[PDB]
């Protein structure tokens, strides 16, 4: 029968990221934009994230992104 497919970012979650301006204040940090840009070019996304769960700047911006997409 039917199954879940929720491992893709939705149009409503995309809208809530781009229209939230408090998120943009966190992304304007030059240390965040460099690590976000290097992340997508990496071949091991899970291995890259496991280096940033330990970082107090990258954890705080991730926590705000992860709140914004859960607050649908």
């Amino acid at each position: 029968g039917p199954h879940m497919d929720y491992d893709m970012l939705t149009e409503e979650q995309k809208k809530k990221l781009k229209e939230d301006h408090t998120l943009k204040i966190l992304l304007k940090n030059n240390y965040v934009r460099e690590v976000f840009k290097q992340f997508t070019l990496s071949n091991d996304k899970i291995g890259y994230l496991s280096h940033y769960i330990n970082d107090p700047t990258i954890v705080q911006v991730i926590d705000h992104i992860m709140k914004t997409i859960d607050d649908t």
Partner: peptide, 25 residues
């Protein structure tokens, strides 16, 4: 668990970077 949380996180990184949220130019 971390592995279910990361799948939503990484598709947010890949959207934010493609639309260049931090770059006004």
């Amino acid at each position: 668990d971390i592995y279910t949380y990361e799948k939503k996180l990484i598709k947010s990184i890949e959207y934010i970077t493609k639309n260049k949220f931090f770059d006004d130019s």
